[PDB]
C-alpha cells in the first residue's frame, strides 16, 4: 500500500517515515498487532500517526502500513443485541480468548460473518437502483431489517438470489455492472451519512418521567446535555430511560467507562425486557460500551461510532435514541491530544478544534426523512462532567447555543437524593412550542394551560423563600403559606421518582394529566376556605395529602381508579368546614 | 405567482446558456482533426514556454505530436506523453507544471464573459 | 463573609493560572527563537 516504517515515538504518538504519496487519515496498521493509528500530519513524507491502543515496548523501523482507507464501519445485519464496542470488535469471542481481561491489539471479525439471515429479495434483476434503495429484508427479531443499497451505489442488477438463509459473507445480489452485494458495508465514519430532507418536530419523544417531559419536551433530534456535579442522577437517568422510551431502535454507548461503574449496568440491560414486546430489551438495544482502560482516543473514536449506527437505522425510518454519557470524554480526548502532537492551545486545554465536532454531532443529529424516503429521527442525549463540579466552560456554553433544551441540577437535593433534582430555575425547553397540537391532541388542551399554572406556584414560591428567610414563614398570613406548602408536593412526586420501586419507575401522560389537576383543587378549596376565615392548619389533617403521595404507587390501570377517587372528598369536607 | 414567473424565466435562460456551452465545447472538440489545430497548438505552446523560464517538457496526443516537431526541437527540446485541446508542459526543472490548456482558456472564459453573451441574449 | 471569600479565590486562581498559559506559549516561543538560532547560526 502506502508504506514505510516507524521513526519516532512520543508515547502513543508516532511519526513514521518511508511514507510518501500518502493519503490523509487511514487505517494505519503498524507493527505486531497492526496497531491501528491515523495519518494526521503529512509533512514531507512524514505521517503523524496516532494509534488507538497501547503502544509500548517498541522500537524504530517497525512496519507501517497505511491502508488507503480509514474506518468505514460494517453496517448491516446482526445489529441488535450487539456489541461491537469502541474498538469495533465484538467482545463475545474475545472475552474468552483474552482470558477474561481485555488485552491489547486483539483483532477479531467486526461482525458474525457466518451468521445466516433472512434474505428477502424485494427486487428483480435487470433492474436499476440508486444508493440508498432497499433491496431486501432480513426480518430479525421483530424487525424488518432493510437491506440498504448504500449511497453512491446505483444501477443494473445482474441477479437477485431467491430468498432464504444466507451469511453476510454470501453476496446475494450481483449487480449487472458487477457488484456482489454481501450483506454489510463500510461507511466512513466521519463522513456523515446523508439524508433526503430534515424534518421537523411535531410530537414529543417521550421516554418517560413526568415533569421532565411535561415541562421540558423534546425534539426528535432533541439534545440537551446534563450539567450535573459528580454523583448526580444523570448517569442512571439514561439507564432509567433504558427502560422508558417511545423508541424504535435503542442505542447505548458507554463512552469510555470504568468497569465497576458498569458491571451491573452491563448486565442490567440484559435484565431489562422489552416493553414494545416482552423479550429482552437486548432485542432492540445494543451494547456499544467500551472502556476507560483503553485510551482516550478510542473514546473519541467511539463517539463517531454511536452516531453512525444511529444513522443507518434512522435511515431505516427509525426513532433512534442515543444516549451517550459524558462529553467529558470527547473533550478530554483531543483536550490532551494536541499537546502530544504539540499544537497551539487554547486555555483549559481546549483545542479550539472544538465545537466543530461537537456541533457536528448535532448536525448529523435530527429529525429527518432520509434517502430511502424513510423518516426517522435520532434523538440525542448528552451528559457532562462539570470540572469544578460547576460551570465555567465554553464546552458547556456554546454547547448550550447548539442544543435543543438545557438542564441544570442541584447538590442539596442529592442529599435526600432526588430523581431528578432538576432546576428549571435554570433549565428550559423550547420544544414547548413545536409540538403544541400534539399536546392538546393526545392530552387535550388544559395541559398546555394547567402546566403553566403549576409553574406559577413555585415561581412565586421562589420570591417567597426570600421572605421566609428574611423574617420567617410566619410574618406571613394565610394565603401565602398556602402556596408555600403546595409547592412541596409538586416536587415531592416530581423529584422523588424512583427506579427500584417498580410502580415508581414508569409514568405516562395519563399519569401526568391526572395528578396535575388534583392539586389545583386543593388550592381553590383552601382559597375559599380561608376567605371563609379558616386557618389552613386544619387542612393539614387531610388524609388525602398522603393519598396524593401514593401517586407513584398508583399505576396506570389504577390511575383512573385513583383519579376520580380523591376529587370528591376534597370538595366535600373543605367546602363544609 | 410572481416568484414562479421569475423562476420560469430563469429556467429558460439557464437552458440557453447551457446549450451555448455545449456547442462551444463540441465545436472546440471538432477542432483537432482540422489543420488549424496544429496551428492553434503552438500559440499556447509558446505561451507556456513564455510562462516557463527553463523548459523541459511538453506533451502531445499521438495525433498532435507531429504539429510540434518544430517546437519539439525548440522549447524543452522534448515531447513526450499526451495531454487535450490545450497544451501542458513543464519547465524550470520539472517541478512546475504550469500549463495553459485551450480548455484552460475555457474554464476561465466560458463562465467569465458569459455575462456579455447572456447580455446579448437577454438584451 | 465566607460566600464572598470563595468568590475572590475562584477569580484569583483563574487569573493566576493565566500566567502559565502565557509562559506555556512563551516557552514554545523561546523554542522558536532558539530553533532559529540553531539553524540560522547552524543549518
Amino acid at each position: 500500500m502506502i508504506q514505510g516504517v516507524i521513526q519516532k515515538i512520543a508515547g502513543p504518538a508516532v511519526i513514521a517515515k518511508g511514507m510518501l504519496g500518502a493519503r490523509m487519515y487511514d487505517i494505519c496498521k503498524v507493527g505486531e498487532e497492526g496497531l491501528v493509528g491515523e495519518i494526521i500530519r503529512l509533512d514531507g513524507d512524514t505521517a503523524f500517526v496516532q494509534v488507538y491502543e497501547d503502544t509500548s515496548g517498541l522500537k524504530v523501523g517497525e512496519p507501517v502500513v497505511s491502508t488507503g482507507l480509514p474506518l468505514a464501519v460494517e453496517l448491516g445485519p446482526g445489529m441488535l443485541n450487539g456489541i461491537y464496542d469502541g474498538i469495533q470488535r465484538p467482545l463475545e469471542r474475545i472475552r474468552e480468548k483474552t482470558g477474561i481481561y481485555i488485552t491489547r491489539g486483539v483483532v477479531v471479525h467486526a461482525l458474525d460473518r457466518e451468521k445466516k439471515w433472512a434474505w428477502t429479495p424485494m427486487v428483480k434483476p435487470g433492474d436499476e437502483v440508486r444508493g440508498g434503495m432497499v433491496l431486501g429484508t432480513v426480518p430479525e427479531f421483530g424487525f424488518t431489517h432493510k437491506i440498504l443499497v448504500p449511497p453512491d451505489v446505483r444501477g443494473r442488477v445482474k441477479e437477485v438470489k431467491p430468498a432464504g438463509e444466507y451469511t453476510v459473507e454470501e453476496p446475494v445480489v450481483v449487480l449487472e455492472d458487477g457488484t456482489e452485494l454481501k450483506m454489510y458495508h463500510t461507511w466512513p465514519v466521519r463522513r456523515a451519512r446523508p439524508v433526503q430532507r430534515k424534518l421537523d418536530p411535531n410530537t414529543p419523544f417521550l421516554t418517560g418521567m413526568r415533569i421532565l417531559d411535561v415541562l421540558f419536551p423534546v425534539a426528535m433530534g432533541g439534545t440537551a446535555a446534563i450539567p450535573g456535579p459528580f454523583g448526580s442522577g444523570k448517569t442512571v437517568t439514561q439507564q432509567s430511560l433504558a427502560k422508558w422510551s417511545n423508541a424504535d431502535v435503542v442505542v447505548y454507548v458507554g463512552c469510555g467507562e470504568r468497569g465497576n461503574e458498569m458491571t451491573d449496568v452491563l448486565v442490567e440491560f440484559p435484565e431489562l425486557t422489552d416493553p414494545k414486546t416482552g423479550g429482552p430489551l437486548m432485542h432492540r438495544t445494543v451494547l456499544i460500551a467500551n472502556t476507560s482502560n483503553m485510551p482516550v482516543a478510542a473514546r473519541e473514536a467511539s463517539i463517531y461510532v454511536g452516531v453512525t449506527i444511529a444513522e443507518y437505522f434512522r435511515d431505516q425510518g427509525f426513532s433512534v435514541a442515543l444516549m451517550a454519557d459524558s462529553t467529558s470524554r470527547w473533550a478530554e480526548a483531543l483536550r490532551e491530544i494536541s499537546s502530544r502532537l504539540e499544537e497551539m492551545p487554547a486555555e483549559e486545554g481546549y483545542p479550539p478544534y472544538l465545537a466543530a465536532r461537537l456541533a457536528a454531532f448535532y448536525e448529523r443529529a435530527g429529525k429527518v426523512i432520509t434517502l430511502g424516503g424513510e423518516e426517522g429521527a435520532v434523538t440525542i442525549v448528552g451528559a457532562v462532567s462539570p470540572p469544578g463540579g460547576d460551570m465555567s466552560e465554553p464546552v458547556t456554553q456554546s454547547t448550550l447555543r447548539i442544543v435543543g433544551a438545557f438542564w441544570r441540577l442541584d447538590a442539596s437535593l442529592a442529599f435526600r437524593r432526588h430523581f431528578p433534582a432538576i432546576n428549571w430555575n435554570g433549565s428550559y425547553s423550547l420544544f414547548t412550542s413545536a409540538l403544541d397540537p400534539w399536546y392538546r391532541e393526545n392530552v387535550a388542551e388544559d395541559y398546555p394551560e394547567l402546566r403553566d399554572a403549576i409553574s406559577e406556584l413555585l415561581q412565586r414560591e421562589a420570591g417567597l423563600q426570600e421572605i421566609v428567610q428574611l423574617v420567617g414563614p410566619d410574618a406571613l398570613q394565610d394565603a401565602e403559606r398556602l402556596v408555600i406548602e403546595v409547592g412541596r408536593i409538586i416536587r415531592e412526586d416530581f423529584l422523588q421518582q424512583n427506579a427500584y420501586h417498580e410502580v415508581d419507575a414508569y409514568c405516562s401522560m395519563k399519569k401526568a394529566y391526572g395528578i396535575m389537576k388534583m392539586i389545583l383543587a386543593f388550592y381553590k378549596e383552601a382559597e375559599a376556605a380561608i376567605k371563609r376565615g379558616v386557618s389552613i392548619d386544619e387542612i393539614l389533617q387531610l388524609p388525602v395529602l398522603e393519598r396524593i403521595g401514593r401517586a407513584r404507587y398508583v399505576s396506570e390501570e389504577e390511575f383512573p381508579a385513583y383519579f376520580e377517587e380523591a376529587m370528591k372528598e376534597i370538595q366535600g369536607a373543605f367546602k363544609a368546614l | 405567482g410572481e416568484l414562479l414567473v421569475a423562476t420560469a424565466r430563469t429556467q429558460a435562460r439557464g437552458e440557453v446558456l447551457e446549450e451555448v456551452r455545449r456547442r462551444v465545447r463540441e465545436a472546440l472538440e471538432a477542432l483537432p482533426q482540422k489543420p488549424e489545430w496544429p496551428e492553434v497548438v503552438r500559440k499556447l505552446a509558446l505561451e507556456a514556454l513564455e510562462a516557463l523560464p527553463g523548459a523541459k517538457a511538453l506533451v502531445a496526443n499521438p495525433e498532435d505530436l507531429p504539429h510540434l516537431e518544430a517546437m519539439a526541437r525548440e522549447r524543452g527540446v522534448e515531447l513526450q506523453a499526451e495531454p487535450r485541446l490545450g497544451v501542458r508542459a513543464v519547465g524550470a526543472e520539472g517541478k512546475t507544471q504550469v500549463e495553459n490548456s485551450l480548455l484552460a482558456r475555457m474554464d476561465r472564459a466560458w463562465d467569465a464573459m458569459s455575462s456579455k453573451v447572456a447580455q446579448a441574449l437577454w438584451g | 463573609i465566607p460566600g464572598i471569600r470563595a468568590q475572590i479565590r475562584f477569580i484569583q486562581q483563574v487569573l493566576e493560572q493565566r500566567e502559565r498559559e502565557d509562559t506555556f506559549r512563551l516557552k514554545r516561543i523561546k523554542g522558536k527563537i532558539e530553533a532559529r538560532e540553531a539553524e540560522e547560526e547552524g543549518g
Binding site: 493519503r23 487519515y25 514531507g44 430534515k198 425534539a219 433530534g221 | 446558456l17 447580455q119 | -
Partner: protein
C-alpha cells in the same frame, strides 16, 4: 495556469506547497486533487518559496501526488446583480436553490474600499419599529448598528422577526412622499440550525419577505473556515443596492459569535498572541472593518442600516468579545434576563439603552416637540424605582415615604404592560401616551428634568 508540486506541510487545514514565490497577496486558489475532489484555499500569507494556504475543507484523503495547485484569482472579488434578489446562497457564494446562477453585472473586491467620512451622509433618519423599547429608548435612525446581547433561551431570531414585520417608515413627521423609502431584505448566516431554519424561512413565506431577498446561508455542518469570509461577501452586495438602488438596507448580520472563534484558531495556529483572555486582540480590528462598512450616503439614498446580532457568553457583557463589540457599535440592546422566566413577550431590559443617536440629528419634528425630556425623565425615574428593590427587601416591609412607593411601584407597572407587546403597531404617540400614564400617578413637582408645561399638556 501555474501548477505546483509537493506538499510541504499538511496538518490541520493549514497548507503549504513550495515552488511558489510568485504570487500576490491574498489569493483564491484551488487544489485540484486526483481524488476527484477539488478543494479550495486562500493565500492568506505569502512566503518567499512556499506560502500559507487557508484550506476551506477537510484535509482528508490528501496525498503528496494528487497535489495540484491552481490560481483562481490572486485577489478576491465577486460579481453583483439584483438578479440575486430573491435568491438563496450557500456561504461559498454559490446560489443554492437549483436555480442556475445569476450573472455578474459588475465585479468588485470582497473587501472593498474605505469611505470618506465627510462623504457619509449623517444618520438622523428616524423610522418606526413599532416597539417602544426601541422607539423611545435607544432610538432608531437609519444607519444604525446595534445588537442584542443574547444567549440561553434568549431569542434573537424571534425578536428579529418582529422587526421583520414592523419595520416601517415615517415620511410623515417630515412631510415627504412614500415611494421614497424602500428597505432591502438582506440576510446572512453563521453556524445555523435546522430548528431555526424553517422558523426563519416561514417569515418570508409569512411576510412575503422573500421580497428582494438576499439570503446567505451557512450552518455549521459545512467546514468552519468560511464563517468569516461570507459576512464580507454579503456585506459587499449591499452597497450596490444601497447606493445604486437606494435602499435602507436591512442588514441581518446574524450572530457574530462564531466569527472570532474559528478566526482565532487560524491566528494562533500560526501564532498570534491572544493577549486577551484567550483571544487575539486585533479581533477588534477584525470586526472593525466589518462595521467600517456603514453610513447614510451623501447624494444617494443609500443608508447602511445595520443589524448586527450576537450571542454572548453567559450573561456577561464583560466577556471579551461583547466588550469591544460594545465600543464599536452605535446601539446596544439587551434582552431582560428577568423576563424570560415570566414569559413576557418580548423580554427586554431597559439597561444598555441609549445608543449613540437620539438628539443628534434628531428628537422632534421627526419625532414631535415633546418627547425628549419625557424620555429623559423616565430614565432616572425608573432607576430610582428598582434602586430600592433591594434596600426595601431588607429594611421595611414598608417604611418608605409612599412617594418613594410610587417610584418603585411604577417600574413594575411600566414593565408589566410595556414589555409585553402583542403584534401591535405602537407609534410614537401610542408610546408617549403610555408614558404619560405612568407619569400620571407620579406627581408634578418631582419632574425636574421636565418643564411644567409638557406634563400637564399631556395629562
Amino acid at each position: 495556469k501555474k501548477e505546483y508540486t509537493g506538499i510541504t506541510y499538511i496538518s490541520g487545514p493549514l497548507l503549504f506547497v513550495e515552488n511558489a514565490k510568485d504570487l500576490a497577496y491574498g489569493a483564491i486558489v484551488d487544489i485540484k486533487d486526483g481524488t476527484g475532489r477539488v478543494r479550495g484555499g486562500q493565500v492568506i500569507e505569502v512566503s518567499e518559496e512556499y506560502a500559507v494556504i487557508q484550506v476551506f475543507e477537510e484535509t482528508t484523503g490528501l496525498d503528496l501526488a494528487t497535489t495540484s495547485v491552481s490560481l483562481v484569482e490572486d485577489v478576491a472579488r465577486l460579481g453583483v446583480s439584483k438578479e440575486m434578489l430573491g435568491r438563496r446562497f450557500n456561504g461559498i457564494g454559490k446560489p443554492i436553490d437549483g436555480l442556475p446562477p445569476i450573472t455578474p453585472e459588475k465585479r468588485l473586491p470582497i473587501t472593498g474600499l474605505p469611505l470618506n467620512p465627510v462623504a457619509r451622509r449623517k444618520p438622523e433618519q428616524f423610522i418606526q419599529t413599532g416597539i417602544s423599547t426601541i422607539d423611545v429608548m435607544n432610538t432608531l435612525v437609519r444607519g444604525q448598528k446595534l445588537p442584542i446581547f443574547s444567549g440561553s433561551g434568549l431569542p434573537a431570531n424571534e425578536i428579529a422577526a418582529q422587526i421583520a414585520r414592523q419595520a416601517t417608515v415615517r415620511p410623515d413627521l417630515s412631510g415627504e412622499g412614500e415611494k421614497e423609502e424602500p428597505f432591502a431584505v438582506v440576510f446572512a448566516a453563521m453556524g445555523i440550525t435546522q430548528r431555526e431554519l424553517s422558523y426563519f424561512i416561514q417569515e418570508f413565506e409569512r411576510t412575503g419577505a422573500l421580497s428582494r431577498s438576499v439570503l446567505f446561508l451557512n450552518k455549521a455542518d459545512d467546514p468552519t473556515i468560511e464563517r468569516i469570509l461570507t459576512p464580507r461577501m454579503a456585506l459587499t452586495v449591499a452597497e450596490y443596492l444601497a447606493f445604486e438602488h437606494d435602499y435602507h438596507v436591512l442588514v441581518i448580520l446574524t450572530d457574530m459569535t462564531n466569527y472570532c472563534e474559528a478566526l482565532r484558531e487560524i491566528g494562533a495556529a500560526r501564532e498570534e498572541i491572544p493577549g486577551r483572555r484567550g483571544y487575539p486582540g486585533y479581533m477588534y480590528t477584525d470586526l472593525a472593518t466589518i462595521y467600517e462598512r456603514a453610513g447614510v450616503v451623501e447624494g444617494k439614498k443609500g443608508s447602511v442600516t445595520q443589524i448586527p446580532i450576537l450571542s454572548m457568553p453567559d450573561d456577561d457583557r464583560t466577556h471579551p468579545i461583547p466588550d469591544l463589540t460594545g465600543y464599536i457599535t452605535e446601539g446596544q440592546i439587551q434582552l431582560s434576563r428577568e423576563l424570560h422566566r415570566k414569559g413576557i413577550y418580548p423580554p427586554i431590559d431597559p439597561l444598555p439603552s441609549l445608543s449613540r443617536l437620539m438628539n443628534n440629528g434628531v428628537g422632534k419634528g421627526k419625532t414631535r416637540e415633546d418627547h425628549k425630556q419625557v424620555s429623559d425623565q423616565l430614565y432616572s425615574a425608573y432607576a430610582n424605582g428598582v434602586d430600592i428593590r433591594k434596600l426595601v427587601a431588607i429594611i421595611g416591609e414598608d417604611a418608605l415615604t409612599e412617594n418613594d412607593r410610587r417610584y418603585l411601584q411604577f417600574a413594575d407597572a411600566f414593565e408589566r404592560f410595556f414589555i409585553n407587546q402583542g403584534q401591535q403597531n405602537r407609534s410614537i404617540e401610542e408610546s408617549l401616551q403610555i408614558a404619560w400614564a405612568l407619569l400620571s400617578m407620579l406627581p408634578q413637582g418631582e419632574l425636574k428634568r421636565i418643564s411644567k408645561d409638557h406634563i400637564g399638556k399631556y395629562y
